[PDB]
Design a protein around this ligand. Structure first.
Ligand SMILES: C[C@H](C[C@@H](C[C@H](C[C@@H](C[C@@H](CCN1CCCC1=O)N1CCCC1=O)N1CCCC1=O)N1CCCC1=O)N1CCCC1=O)N1CCCC1=O
Ligand SMILES: C[C@H](C[C@@H](C[C@H](C[C@@H](C[C@@H](CCN1CCCC1=O)N1CCCC1=O)N1CCCC1=O)N1CCCC1=O)N1CCCC1=O)N1CCCC1=O
Ligand SMILES: C[C@H](C[C@@H](C[C@H](C[C@@H](C[C@@H](CCN1CCCC1=O)N1CCCC1=O)N1CCCC1=O)N1CCCC1=O)N1CCCC1=O)N1CCCC1=O
Ligand SMILES: C[C@H](C[C@@H](C[C@H](C[C@@H](C[C@@H](CCN1CCCC1=O)N1CCCC1=O)N1CCCC1=O)N1CCCC1=O)N1CCCC1=O)N1CCCC1=O
Ligand SMILES: C[C@H](C[C@@H](C[C@H](C[C@@H](C[C@@H](CCN1CCCC1=O)N1CCCC1=O)N1CCCC1=O)N1CCCC1=O)N1CCCC1=O)N1CCCC1=O
Ligand SMILES: C[C@H](C[C@@H](C[C@H](C[C@@H](C[C@@H](CCN1CCCC1=O)N1CCCC1=O)N1CCCC1=O)N1CCCC1=O)N1CCCC1=O)N1CCCC1=O
Ligand SMILES: C[C@H](C[C@@H](C[C@H](C[C@@H](C[C@@H](CCN1CCCC1=O)N1CCCC1=O)N1CCCC1=O)N1CCCC1=O)N1CCCC1=O)N1CCCC1=O
Ligand SMILES: C[C@H](C[C@@H](C[C@H](C[C@@H](C[C@@H](CCN1CCCC1=O)N1CCCC1=O)N1CCCC1=O)N1CCCC1=O)N1CCCC1=O)N1CCCC1=O
Ligand SMILES: COc1cc(CCNC(=O)c2nc(-c3ccccc3C)[nH]c(=O)c2O)ccn1
Ligand SMILES: COc1cc(CCNC(=O)c2nc(-c3ccccc3C)[nH]c(=O)c2O)ccn1
Ligand SMILES: COc1cc(CCNC(=O)c2nc(-c3ccccc3C)[nH]c(=O)c2O)ccn1
Ligand SMILES: COc1cc(CCNC(=O)c2nc(-c3ccccc3C)[nH]c(=O)c2O)ccn1
Ligand SMILES: COc1cc(CCNC(=O)c2nc(-c3ccccc3C)[nH]c(=O)c2O)ccn1
Ligand SMILES: COc1cc(CCNC(=O)c2nc(-c3ccccc3C)[nH]c(=O)c2O)ccn1
Ligand SMILES: COc1cc(CCNC(=O)c2nc(-c3ccccc3C)[nH]c(=O)c2O)ccn1
Ligand SMILES: [Mn+2]
Ligand SMILES: [Mn+2]
Ligand SMILES: [Mn+2]
Ligand SMILES: [Mn+2]
Ligand SMILES: [Mn+2]
Ligand SMILES: [Mn+2]
Ligand SMILES: [Mn+2]
Ligand SMILES: [Mn+2]
Ligand SMILES: [Mn+2]
Ligand SMILES: [Mn+2]
Ligand SMILES: [Mn+2]
Ligand SMILES: [Mn+2]
Ligand SMILES: [Mn+2]
Ligand SMILES: [Mn+2]
Ligand SMILES: [Mn+2]
Ligand SMILES: [Mn+2]
Lengths: 180, 180, 180, 180, 180, 180, 180, 180
């Protein structure tokens, strides 16, 4: 193709982040060359997931997002068959060894309330914790339990607003927002 | 030879883990090419030992497993001739500088109670702590003192069930279980 | 799945070779988890292509195989729009800056004559050079022009027979041969 | 040119520190080849800023100094548009995610009181924290809040006096002091 | 700013190539953020210069392009004060230790004849060799002496047409061509 | 020369440790080729000093031992001219930013009481803390303040007894002990 | 044990050379801790083999020595089943793709004539080339064909005499010579 | 001390070159802190020696300069006891495996004829080849045999004039010239 959004994603995100999002999109029958707005969303969600696991202790989180579908489900089985928690119907993003629960991370262009309502409606397993982030600096989590400390969460929303600024600087933000 | 279990071990475990287990098996007159089930057990026990030492402080544990027999006994002498603890009759796996005791790590395909009974019957030195892990997610330790925190131990049993799943996925688990 | 052939490919070939073949198979709607015999063939063909380019001078060959379909065709256009050679109907493997021609590399489980007859029948552009290799140590090329020197070609067929031996050692060769 | 101060800066400071100060000076129309005293000051201020961020937690500080003017202001916007703090009129050096305030770092050849009076007079945003260091081992901060612990701050002033000694050892200190 | 050409240059060229062109443009009072077409030209000329020196022997060429103005002229003085050749009025790109002459490399969007006529009219030192390349695959040199072998020069023009294709793929070529 | 002790030191200690001890011995007019027993002592003292600084926080200790005489005294001046402590008459080994005092580390083949009595008699500055270690597992410090935690100190004496065992294993210990 | 020869081997030879010789000795039921003279011989023979392959072209030699017995024989089969040469009764050291023959390398403490007579008497396959080196600087090869150029062979014998000097410097040469 | 020449040497020459010259000067009872002009000469001579060996084939030269006195003489013995050449009375710089002779490299601030006359008068072994270089771009060798090709020698004299320019740029050349 040859879009400005594609070259911005390869320049804005880490090379391994781009490669992991490309594998995830291709595994689900999607083309980052054409679905460039979704390409920027998968990369952003991947970085937020990895920054989220970077907060806390060394053995606190088990990263589920970023693996291929078969191996990601294999880790979920080992976590469920060990701690005893229920098997989630959908693939979560992380697991908290400190709180004994799975975490579903969400990044939002609209309001954090709307996505969470849709994310909580999909996830029938009420035990799975949910944590939403927005490109404007807002956040919301299940039972007001934000898991990480304030500084690690603040670094996540700061990076989110930087991506939003770099997008609007080259005029890709308007098409990116009205696309979720 | 040319077994499926051998190629799985080289693919499932870290290269240095495979090399250390090969040296340990050859030092005791064993061939990983033929004793492929024991090859997978030594690798699993080595990774659990190294993950165990990864939990805690930086100078907490002194790793005994993984060294050759002569040097491993040399470290044991230095630890005994310094802290004043008794010399164990058999080579332990680690030493706890925080609890002032040696640790014997065990990985189990049957029940954790049976191995511990055999491990405690062999080790005459009652001061040496014993910690058993199973491929189903169970654990048991001397005086209910599990040494590490809950998160580090949970990561160990999660990896153990992942190895069990990958084994049964290629149909090596049945021969691996009925072989201990 | 969980096949012996898959674990052998990850153990026999270089990690980047495995990753490049996985991307090529997925790009064309193929699964290395199920098409394990084709997985071993794409890896073997990729290594032969890279060993082929390793022979000769530093700027002699332009590697076409291993790139994604869009970029690989982009290089072909630049080579054709510069030297003046005809655009091949199908994607070749390399280009010879010394002989001013594209090269189509083939690896064969049957006879080198049969594949070349099929490879020459497909490639309508008669200018594209063709070079076939077999797992038994045979080779054949267009106009008896084998491009590289004898030592580099001998190293290719030696590696091919080593892959054949390691396959039959674990009893994957019979299914691999009767599958082309 | 060919000054002794220039060769001392390249020998005393880290290569990346020298490169970052050269880019900052050139971006503001300054030549490190001629403004060698200012070259040593920008390098010293850069190292102090980086040593300052090295103290504390992992996600405590967001480094603003060292970036180009456009990107540095982009981070400031993301920090302000997220936490809700006021936009500073001038570019600060760091941001404290623990104390929710920007930090202006200063290095001084005269008295710490004089610079702070000038630094506080320039910065109209009273919320921005100010922390001054001197080449004699003195320090002063807003509301006597020195942010970091005593050991990290002591390491900063120790390095400052080492730079002062190495300068006077080669007789560049007198020209460096009477130049601020 | 936020241009598509800028993000393409950072994605198309090597990171060090981008950094060297940014330093060269800033040293001569130019902004790669605004002069994005000239930014792509300096990067292309830098890569061609480095690919040119990559052809031949190990000690054949002395790279002049890529250094800052003062050091680049220092090398020219050492080359002139040693071999005895005349000092060029303008900074050349390379020096040939095999042919005992400086080389001026040119990359062209129009015809190779027009630039060479302007390049030869500027360079009064007739001893300095001139070698022009075009984005269409053409080349021309002084006295028909193309210095390098055919394969190394062909690799240069092939890369030039690839840059032209990637530019027109994202629709930056038309503005890039009508800008020289 | 060609001594067994020399080859043991290069094999027992880290390469950089050997290089730092060689520079220290040569700076004071000593030859590690002939003073092989002193060569093993300087290496042992250097490793203990570096293991000592490895215990505690990140910015707790400033390493003085291992630097050349001029730079080591330069750091001492910066530490004294900043914290305000007295200048020691002799070069110490470390400085404690947490306890605000210099540390003199000693390694002993005889009794820890004898060296400390000689070390305390030499060091007139009573503020400088003193910490002695022995090859048998004993330790003693000023005012019974052992600075580090128990685990870090235990790791030091364990390494000391390992060096003693490896020395007696090759029969260099007897000459090493009766040489202090 | 604790021998001077052992510590000299670990200090004189490359770490990977020592590890490869240890694996080869253990595979054949030998202990480098006790067979220290044979330990120095296997290391010397391994380095000579690797220096030998370093001479010539890039794809000239296929290294057989250094591999485990099963894989080394696998390469020999691939070389024989491709070029058509006869299978040697004993494991050779290298294969010459330029001369189409296997090479048996020998290192000698006595006279080069005596070993070659024993090496040629053992190797029944007269096609396998034989090349002997001595610690005094002598060499002899089959049909006076020394394969490599003079400079590469001279570097081999120079290293051999350096090992002999370092051995006699520490007084291990006399026991090493009267041990072959 | 604190001289401009010292900081220039650490900035002009490669770090390992500086370390090797410091060891050589200290081994012969010289201080680079005070003998700064000799410090720049040993570094220059070391780089010329290493650039000289960089010219030619891979196994052509054996580097003698840069080693400590004992090991350097050990290599000379191995070279003499192998090729059969005479033992030089003084330590040479290199040995030519292609020409079978030792090489004495010289760098000169005066005329190349004067040094060679002194270098040839000292070296009684007439077989040792002599090659002189000057800071003005001149060279002279025994029997007009300049060993290397023209391009490698030209790169040496070009670097020599660059060092001369950087010295006079900071005004250290006049003291450096009138000091040989
Ligand atoms: C484990 C490995 C990759 C991990 C992904 C994650 C990346 C991590 C890298 C760190 C270092 N930082 C931080 C600074 C820059 C950098 O690089 N971070 C965190 C922030 C952004 C980033 O990049 N982590 C965590 C453990 C080590 C590691 O690398 N992943 C990928 C999905 C599953 C997983 O665990 N794996 C696992 C197998 C395949 C693979 O690649
Ligand atoms: C010390 C060294 C090897 C250590 C073994 C152990 C390995 C450690 C590596 C870490 C990093 N991680 C973690 C992520 C992947 C990785 O790589 N972990 C822990 C988890 C799995 C693993 O691999 N550790 C601990 C100290 C540093 C080190 O490497 N061993 C081997 C036995 C004795 C010993 O102390 N030694 C010692 C001499 C020989 C040698 O090799
Ligand atoms: C250029 C780069 C990758 C190259 C592939 C190829 C791999 C090469 C690596 C060499 C080193 N050796 C040899 C010993 C082991 C090793 O590692 N060999 C050759 C033998 C096997 C192997 O692995 N080469 C050649 C140039 C440098 C390089 O790496 N490819 C991939 C397809 C296109 C291409 O040019 N590229 C290009 C962009 C993406 C990428 O990755
Ligand atoms: C992030 C990266 C560079 C960082 C600058 C800073 C440098 C850091 C390096 C550490 C490791 N240590 C410590 C020992 C020596 C060393 O090397 N320290 C701190 C002390 C001196 C030093 O050097 N940090 C912090 C995060 C990792 C890193 O490297 N910077 C530069 C300005 C903005 C920023 O965050 N970035 C960001 C994009 C461009 C770039 O280069
Ligand atoms: C010397 C050094 C940089 C050199 C520039 C040049 C880059 C070279 C790198 C090679 C490796 N390849 C090839 C494959 C990818 C890669 O990376 N190539 C050539 C092709 C593209 C490229 O990148 N070369 C040549 C010598 C080693 C080196 O790196 N330059 C910069 C201007 C002056 C100079 O000599 N210098 C010198 C001082 C500052 C600095 O950085
Ligand atoms: C700073 C640097 C060297 C330091 C010496 C010291 C070495 C440190 C290395 C660490 C990593 N570990 C631990 C595992 C193996 C290893 O490697 N440890 C500690 C244990 C043994 C060891 O080796 N440290 C501490 C800071 C980083 C570093 O490397 N020194 C030398 C004297 C002064 C000093 O601060 N410097 C400073 C300038 C010259 C130089 O080289
Ligand atoms: C291929 C690899 C190891 C090779 C052994 C050999 C070592 C080579 C290393 C080179 C680089 N130099 C030279 C300077 C120092 C150094 O390091 N040299 C030659 C001189 C001494 C030395 O060390 N070579 C040659 C190819 C690349 C490589 O490393 N071997 C081991 C036996 C079989 C084999 O091919 N393999 C193969 C699989 C296991 C393994 O490890
Ligand atoms: C062998 C090793 C060091 C060698 C010195 C020499 C340095 C060589 C490094 C090359 C790479 N280049 C070139 C580009 C920059 C660089 O780095 N060049 C040549 C030009 C300048 C330079 O630096 N060489 C040659 C072989 C590999 C190596 O490194 N020396 C030191 C004296 C004896 C010797 O052989 N040794 C030997 C034992 C101790 C040690 O360190
Ligand atoms: C669209 O198919 C896929 C599937 C995967 C694997 C698992 N995916 C997730 O787990 C996940 N996906 C999204 C997301 C992103 C873009 C558009 C729509 C959604 C719902 N957002 C999340 O927060 C999240 O956790 C990866 C990528 N694309
Ligand atoms: C099956 O679709 C693909 C397509 C590609 C991209 C381009 N492919 C080739 O260029 C190529 N493909 C084969 C091959 C391998 C397995 C089965 C059948 C064939 C014909 N053999 C070659 O020699 C060769 O050059 C890569 C992988 N799979
Ligand atoms: C002179 O223009 C510049 C501008 C920048 C970008 C932002 N600069 C700062 O933020 C900053 N500048 C100084 C400083 C240093 C030398 C002379 C005068 C001053 C006031 N001191 C600080 O403490 C500080 O934070 C970088 C370098 N030079
Ligand atoms: C515009 O000022 C500069 C100056 C330098 C330093 C030296 N420059 C060259 O040597 C050089 N410059 C060009 C070029 C590029 C863009 C627009 C116009 C020209 C004439 N083309 C060349 O071929 C070439 O060798 C680097 C970058 N920009
Ligand atoms: C003998 O001259 C030197 C001098 C230095 C520089 C500073 N030295 C120390 O600081 C230091 N020296 C010893 C030590 C070691 C061997 C024999 C006698 C002594 C007293 N022991 C320590 O504990 C210690 O701190 C380094 C090496 N050798
Ligand atoms: C003693 O068993 C072994 C066997 C191997 C595997 C293959 N070995 C060789 O190929 C080989 N062995 C020697 C050698 C060395 C010491 C003592 C006696 C001999 C004959 N010399 C060679 O030249 C040579 O090629 C490796 C090591 N030890
Ligand atoms: C002054 O003592 C030393 C000794 C060595 C070891 C061997 N030295 C040489 O081989 C050598 N020395 C010089 C040189 C340099 C400065 C002043 C006088 C001379 C004659 N010039 C050479 O060309 C050369 O080969 C290294 C350094 N300094
Ligand atoms: Mn997800
Ligand atoms: Mn999610
Ligand atoms: Mn054990
Ligand atoms: Mn155990
Ligand atoms: Mn192909
Ligand atoms: Mn093909
Ligand atoms: Mn600032
Ligand atoms: Mn500041
Ligand atoms: Mn130019
Ligand atoms: Mn040019
Ligand atoms: Mn000391
Ligand atoms: Mn001490
Ligand atoms: Mn052999
Ligand atoms: Mn042999
Ligand atoms: Mn010399
Ligand atoms: Mn010389």
């Amino acid at each position: 193709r040859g879009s400005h959004m594609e070259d911005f994603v390869r320049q804005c995100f880490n090379p391994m982040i781009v490669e992991l999002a490309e594998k995830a999109m291709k595994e689900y029958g999607e083309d980052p060359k054409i679905e460039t707005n979704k390409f920027a969303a998968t990369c952003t969600h991947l970085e937020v997931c990895f920054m989220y696991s970077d907060g806390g202790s060394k053995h606190r989180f088990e990263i589920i997002e970023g693996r291929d579908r078969i191996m990601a489900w294999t880790v979920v089985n080992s976590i469920c068959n060990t701690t005893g928690v229920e098997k989630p119907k959908f693939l979560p993003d992380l697991y908290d060894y400190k709180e004994n629960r799975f975490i579903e991370i969400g990044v939002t262009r609209r309001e954090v309330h709307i996505y969470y309502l849709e994310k909580a409606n999909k996830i029938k397993s009420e035990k799975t914790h949910i944590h939403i982030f927005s490109f404007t600096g807002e956040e919301m989590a299940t039972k007001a339990d934000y898991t990480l400390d304030e500084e690690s969460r603040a670094r996540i929303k700061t990076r989110l607003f930087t991506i939003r600024q770099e997008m609007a600087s080259r005029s890709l933000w308007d098409s990116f927002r009205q696309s979720e």
